[PDB]
Design a protein around this motif. Structure first.
Motif, PDB file in Angstrom:
ATOM      1  N   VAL A  44      25.063  48.442  50.092  1.00 22.19           N
ATOM      2  CA  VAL A  44      25.098  49.521  49.109  1.00 22.19           C
ATOM      3  C   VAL A  44      26.571  49.864  48.907  1.00 22.19           C
TER       4      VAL A  44
ATOM      5  N   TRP B 207      29.376  52.019  46.253  1.00 16.40           N
ATOM      6  CA  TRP B 207      29.558  53.025  45.224  1.00 16.40           C
ATOM      7  C   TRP B 207      30.811  52.667  44.417  1.00 16.40           C
TER       8      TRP B 207
ATOM      9  N   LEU C 266      30.221  56.407  37.598  1.00 17.11           N
ATOM     10  CA  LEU C 266      30.294  56.195  39.041  1.00 17.11           C
ATOM     11  C   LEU C 266      28.970  55.682  39.657  1.00 17.11           C
TER      12      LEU C 266
ATOM     13  N   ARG D 170      22.752  48.742  44.900  1.00 14.89           N
ATOM     14  CA  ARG D 170      22.234  47.918  45.985  1.00 14.89           C
ATOM     15  C   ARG D 170      22.414  46.481  45.510  1.00 14.89           C
TER      16      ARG D 170
END
Ligand SMILES: *[C@@H]1O[C@H](CO)[C@@H](O[C@@H]2O[C@H](CO)[C@@H](O[C@@H]3O[C@H](CO)[C@@H](O)[C@H](O[C@H]4O[C@H](CO)[C@@H](O)[C@H](O)[C@@H]4O)[C@@H]3O)[C@H](O)[C@H]2NC(C)=O)[C@H](O)[C@H]1NC(C)=O
Ligand SMILES: *[C@@H]1O[C@H](CO)[C@@H](O[C@@H]2O[C@H](CO)[C@@H](O)[C@H](O)[C@H]2NC(C)=O)[C@H](O)[C@H]1NC(C)=O
Ligand SMILES: *[C@@H]1O[C@H](CO)[C@@H](O[C@@H]2O[C@H](CO)[C@@H](O)[C@H](O)[C@H]2NC(C)=O)[C@H](O)[C@H]1NC(C)=O
Ligand SMILES: *[C@@H]1O[C@H](CO)[C@@H](O[C@@H]2O[C@H](CO)[C@@H](O)[C@H](O)[C@H]2NC(C)=O)[C@H](O)[C@H]1NC(C)=O
Ligand SMILES: *[C@@H]1O[C@H](CO)[C@@H](O[C@@H]2O[C@H](CO)[C@@H](O)[C@H](O)[C@H]2NC(C)=O)[C@H](O)[C@H]1NC(C)=O
Ligand SMILES: CN1[C@@H](CC(=O)c2ccccc2)CCC[C@H]1C[C@H](O)c1ccccc1
Ligand SMILES: CN1[C@@H](CC(=O)c2ccccc2)CCC[C@H]1C[C@H](O)c1ccccc1
Ligand SMILES: CN1[C@@H](CC(=O)c2ccccc2)CCC[C@H]1C[C@H](O)c1ccccc1
Ligand SMILES: CN1[C@@H](CC(=O)c2ccccc2)CCC[C@H]1C[C@H](O)c1ccccc1
Ligand SMILES: CN1[C@@H](CC(=O)c2ccccc2)CCC[C@H]1C[C@H](O)c1ccccc1
Lengths: 205, 205, 205, 205, 205
Positions: free
Chosen positions: A52, A54, A117, A121
């Motif tokens: 994951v 960001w 933003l 996954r």
């Protein structure tokens, strides 16, 4: 409010989200960074890492600016990303499509600066053969525009973050570095930039 | 009926579902609560919990109100959520997208109060290392708006429910607590609220 | 034919599929029944049953009627369900979304009676401890409207069918009963009806 | 820029993406090539190979050309493939649909030459019974148009690439050859061309 | 070409793809056949067969015909199936939805004859308990229209093909028959036709 409703109506008028918002042969600068939040799994047989991450992107779109005194109180707005132009940025190492975990919305302020933003996954290809050793496995995550060269889309780098890494996974983070580059490819006259993140990690003993 | 058909036609006119319905710098208050219906599975290796949770949200949208004597008999209407503004509320711990189990409809009464009550199947990240002990594993479920600060969207809390928990699963519910919070983040001028649910549970036998 | 093409054009004109077709405070009666076609699997650890069920729904929509002599030869039409109002009926026990196996079409006759008969692959929650015994596991399948109370949508029951049950699965059917009910919930002033099917079955080994 | 925005508006006007852009007994020539990037897996029981392949297609669409002095500075544009006509090219050996890994965009220059270069994750049927031997398994990958004969769509071949093959998988690439062909089928008067890639590979160790 | 572009514009004008193209109470004849291309797997526990089957359908739509001398050179066109009426034909034995492997396009000639030939990956229910014996497992694949009776849609049969069967699977083909039938169902006044394929197969020694 009423001022917001009027502003959204004006922003979409004569706006084509398929056209990169360059202005007189000056590129759109796109700031790009990454925060590794979790390593979910490592498949040693098939050479796949599951993460994951960001992603943090921002740029200026000069068609999205407004006069603050025409729309008093309205400093920024929340807009679906599908109604704007967005960077066509790709993870070159990816072996499946991304699954987006966050609402597909962006923030736009009064001088046309956009922030988008997405948390994703993602599974990708990497040689993980030293993952269960002291000096672990080291993987490259290469990001770049798929269709825009340097003179159209100026990809720039920002500081990576390790502070959000989840402490309770069965893998620990040994290091993260980053590097902007620029290359000529066989296809094309113009060079293409990229931002590559190098992540070193290992299994917990 | 004929009055309903005319009402739906008026409600959609000059309505943009992408614009949060604030009025003169007064936020939209959103009441939020959760009922844990089932713990489907716990993945001890990958640190993942699989649940069904029933989310309960309500708020007032001043654009959706009508005069009761203009539309006699019509006290409330059933409307697809895609035609309204809805809170962009996110589970921060989520590692996949939610699967919505209920019809995507909301109830709206004549003074513009909306109720939207989705039941969702969701997998999320948590340290479940004491799940098979007496005191159990304890997981935090943090919910909040993705793009709206406190002065736009005032997130408020309501009483959690354990009464709907399924008795025949292989996990038992030791406790559930809840807490509203509000913080300033490094990014932004304005503070962001959240509602966090703490769930303690353990394996049976 | 030409008369059909003209009829479809008139049926969609001034028609909103989001509005339940009540008429002067008289509810829409919806007849509901179920035919259990297969028990595909039983997950004893996670307490899940996997079935194929054929749902049979019918109701009258007074906006879909036509004069037979204006459209000679046209007794009934085949229409996509997305263009009509349909019941928002939910399986309360469901832990995943349904997978619809049939074309999403409905039959409508000249007095506005609609038939919509979807076959669905569905997984749901049930206590299946006892499945491998003489008396078997017994599971409840509760169906009802998500947003419409008794005075809007009058759910009525019809005779259940076992004749389509597949003989070669590894589970056999001990019994099926059914019961209409009506309850008040905490949320709401008005009562909500449901139709519940009770299925008892066991392993053949 | 402003010239780009005006150009996109003109390109879509009177443009039908369902119509192959032939003119008067000239076919559309389509250049096709393939770069095998990875062999992800081989299923010996079910006779299936799992690959990532980068397909490279280009052709001329005479409706997409513009005068360079009417749109000064604009040499090429980035356009979603869904808004253009594209070849209906199929992998005949495929047993699932492709998963597209790249943004669905094409590059178009001022004389109407289009480039579309999708990278795909694809599973297909092949006899892999000698995969764990010295001489290896050999698989044919046959590509061709589904609905257009030689006089409409002239499929032509280009040089295959092995330089992008990932070195750290558990399979090694023994060889890749390629061959254009043309055949008459029973259905149709006109012959249909294809481009077939023959890939020989084996397990390491 | 220019004549094609003009033809596509006329074909879609006043055309509704939801209306079966009957003419004065004369049914639409639909020719249907099947080519079994592969048996991918057999699940003995759950009683499921996994196949790739190539369906071949054709019919006449009198709204899609054109005068050949008005559109010189244009003998047939390639059109997306979504823009035409298509048969609502269902596999009655199916336990999941089909995955379509081919481009969703049809061929239409100048007298309005349509050909639509989808290849599908499909899982279905069958008793496979003698699959690993000399006489093998025998499965019925029943196909028919979901909403149209015999007087609307006249389903007719054509010769089955085993020439496309893949020789290297772990199952071999013992026998194939086919049979058109016509039955009354409980729902309806009018009878419904079907075409059923009976396939006998077994595991290879
Ligand atoms: C479209 O399909 C629908 C659904 O099947 C169909 O609705 C049915 O219509 C018939 C009318 O023909 C209804 O049957 C009647 O019901 C009432 C009692 O509920 C009775 O009055 C009728 O009984 C007899 O009464 C008379 C004695 O005075 C006699 O003269 C004679 O025997 C009458 O038939 C009769 O049973 C039926 O209830 C409805 N069903 C529903 C659910 O509404 C409709 O007719 C179809 N339309 C067309 C145009 O085909
Ligand atoms: C809109 O947002 C942008 C980006 O945050 C603001 O521009 C930045 O302002 C900071 C102030 O400390 C400067 O240091 C940066 O140089 C600016 N960034 C860039 C990329 O130019 C901008 O001020 C905001 N505008 C308004 C009107 O609020
Ligand atoms: C629409 O719904 C709202 C919310 O249920 C109603 O307002 C509430 O009414 C309760 C019970 O009478 C009061 O105690 C609260 O003060 C109200 N709550 C809120 C959040 O405002 C409202 O009455 C309904 N409107 C109409 C016209 O019936
Ligand atoms: C648009 O792109 C095409 C393809 O690259 C160009 O056509 C080629 O041009 C090269 C010279 O760079 C020639 O050697 C080839 O013969 C051409 N190939 C084909 C397939 O025609 C074309 O010139 C470009 N147009 C413009 C205006 O730049
Ligand atoms: C359009 O296609 C149809 C079907 O291929 C053609 O009709 C067939 O022609 C064959 C060959 O001569 C005849 O034996 C049959 O009578 C027809 N079959 C059917 C099912 O109708 C038709 O000729 C074509 N139309 C044009 C104008 O070429
Ligand atoms: C950072 N983010 C703020 C940033 C923002 O408002 C924003 C900017 C751009 C687009 C959409 C939202 C808003 C909400 C609080 C905070 C979220 C938390 O840090 C976070 C980051 C990444 C994964 C999980 C959680
Ligand atoms: C050159 N090519 C990429 C080549 C690469 O390194 C690559 C891509 C995919 C997998 C492995 C390697 C790099 C970026 C530019 C791109 C070409 C242009 O974007 C393009 C995109 C779409 C249509 C036409 C042209
Ligand atoms: C939901 N609730 C009522 C609330 C309502 O009408 C409603 C209001 C607003 C939006 C959607 C539905 C409708 C009737 C059913 C009942 C649902 C049951 O409590 C329940 C829901 C989910 C899991 C377990 C139990
Ligand atoms: C059918 N197709 C032709 C196209 C055509 O006639 C056609 C396509 C679609 C609709 C109507 C007609 C092109 C030549 C090949 C032929 C069929 C091929 O052997 C095939 C191979 C494997 C699976 C399915 C089909
Ligand atoms: C469907 N029904 C008839 C059609 C019809 O009246 C109908 C269909 C759809 C909507 C409304 C009415 C003919 C087509 C099949 C038949 C039902 C078959 O026994 C069946 C068998 C197994 C599973 C499901 C259905």
């Amino acid at each position: 409010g009423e001022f917001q409703r009027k502003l959204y109506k004006e922003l979409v008028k004569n706006y084509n989200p398929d056209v990169i918002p360059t202005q007189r042969d000056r590129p759109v600068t796109v700031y790009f960074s990454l925060s590794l939040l979790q390593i979910m799994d490592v498949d040693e047989k098939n050479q796949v890492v599951d993460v994951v991450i960001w992603l943090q992107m921002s740029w200026t779109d000069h068609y999205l600016q407004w006069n603050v005194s025409e729309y008093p109180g309205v400093k920024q707005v929340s807009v679906p990303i599908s109604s704007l132009w967005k960077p066509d940025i790709l993870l070159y190492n990816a072996i499946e499509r991304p699954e987006v975990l966050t609402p597909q919305l962006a923030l736009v302020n009064s001088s046309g600066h956009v922030q988008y933003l997405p948390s994703i996954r993602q599974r990708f290809s990497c040689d993980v053969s030293g993952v269960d050793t002291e000096s672990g496995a080291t993987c490259k995550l290469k990001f770049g525009s798929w269709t825009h060269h340097s003179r159209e889309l100026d990809l720039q780098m920002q500081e990576a973050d390790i502070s959000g890494y989840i402490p309770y996974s069965r893998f620990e983070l040994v290091g993260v570095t980053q590097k902007r580059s620029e290359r000529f490819y066989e296809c094309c006259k113009e060079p293409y930039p990229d931002v590559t993140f190098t992540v070193t990690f290992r299994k917990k003993g």
